[PDB]
């Protein structure tokens, strides 16, 4: 139980690459130690920036908010799908139904209430302008999940969370977000911008999703751990 834990959260700020490209959080120093003797900031946060959780409400009219997700869905068995070999050749590589099929043939079945995370070797560009990989028309290019592989995780497993080391569940050039409309409305939640997936084993680890709980929220940054 008290084994070795791993941090899976990025350290985000104003320079952190957001989906919209613009900064997603600003700080105002309300009090400083010099004139007041204590420090306090008043933040303005775009809850869908940084290492954050995509609640079902993000893509639904009456889904589950961040506070309504049960605790049983915040402690997930970790199933990391390595596609970084495929992502090296194709920047728009997606976790296809064939990708997770090979995960069974080396680690066994997917446990119930588990989180499926994509390992595309992409959680290392957050320090530069290459994380979004915006094109000449503002079209971002980064790996993601396929909608058909998303629905594959609905019919034949008890997976509850979909995690990605990129900015979105669907890949960059997704003007429709078919993976989002498939995995979120079914009361399953998503995780984006997951860090340090190269430091956890593909199977056996247990994810600890410290999802926020501001009532009525569609998302929000979450401190995520991984008990290896």
Q: Which residues are catalytic?
A: 58
User: Which tokens belong to 158?
Assistant: 């008890």
**For residues 112-141, b (16+ Cβ closer than 10 Å) or e, as one string?**
ebbbbbbbbbbbebbeeeebbbeeeeeebe
Distance CA 2, CA 11 (A): 25
213 binds, among Zn ion, a copy of itself, none (CB under 5 to 8 A by kind): a copy of itself
Residue 54 as a binder of Zn ion (CB under 5 A): the answer is yes
Supply φ then ψ for residue 117, to 5 degrees: -110, 140
Q: DSSP class of residue 165?
A: S
172 binds, among Zn ion, a copy of itself, none (CB under 5 to 8 A by kind): none
Residue 188 as a binder of Zn ion (CB under 5 A): the answer is no
- Please tell me whether residue 93 adopts helix, strand or coil conformation: coil
Q: Tell me whether residue 107 is annotated as binding.
A: no
Please say which residue, 71 or 89, places its beta carbon nearer to a copy of itself. Answer: 71
| Total count of residues recorded for the chain | 228
Q: Are 147 and 95 in contact (CB under 8 A)?
A: no
Q: Tell me whether residue 48 is annotated as binding.
A: yes
Residue 159 as a binder of a copy of itself (CB under 8 A): the answer is no
Binder to Zn ion among 192, 206, 220, 226 (CB under 5 A)?
A: 192
Binder to a copy of itself among 47, 99, 165, 192 (CB under 8 A)?
A: 47
Q: Tell me whether residue 10 is annotated as binding.
A: no
Give the interface with Zn ion as residue ranges (CB under 5 A). Answer: 48, 54, 82, 168, 192, 219
- List, as residue ranges, the binding site: 48, 52, 54, 82, 84, 180, 192
């Amino acid at each position: 139980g008290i084994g070795e834990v791993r941090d899976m959260t990025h350290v985000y700020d104003a320079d952190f690459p957001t989906y919209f490209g613009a900064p997603g959080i600003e700080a105002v120093q309300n009090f400083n130690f010099k004139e007041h003797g204590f420090n306090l900031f008043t933040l303005t946060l775009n809850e869908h920036t940084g290492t954050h959780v995509d609640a079902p409400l993000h893509f639904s009219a009456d889904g589950q908010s961040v506070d309504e997700i049960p605790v049983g869905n915040l402690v997930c068995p970790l199933c990391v799908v390595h596609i970084h070999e495929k992502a090296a050749a194709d920047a728009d590589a997606q976790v296809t139904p064939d990708d997770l099929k090979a995960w069974i043939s080396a680690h066994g079945p997917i446990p119930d209430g588990a989180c499926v995370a994509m390992h595309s070797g992409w959680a290392g560009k957050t320090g530069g302008a290459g994380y979004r990989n915006a094109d000449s028309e503002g079209k971002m290019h980064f790996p993601g999940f396929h909608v058909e592989a998303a629905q594959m995780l609905i019919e034949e497993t008890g997976a509850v969370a979909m995690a990605v080391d990129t900015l979105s569940l669907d890949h960059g050039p997704s003007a429709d977000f078919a993976t989002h409309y498939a995995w979120l409305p079914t009361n399953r939640y998503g995780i984006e911008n997951l860090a340090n997936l190269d430091k956890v084993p593909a199977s056996g680890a247990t994810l600890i999703v410290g999802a926020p709980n501001h009532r009525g929220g569609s998302g929000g940054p979450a401190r995520i751990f991984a008990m290896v």
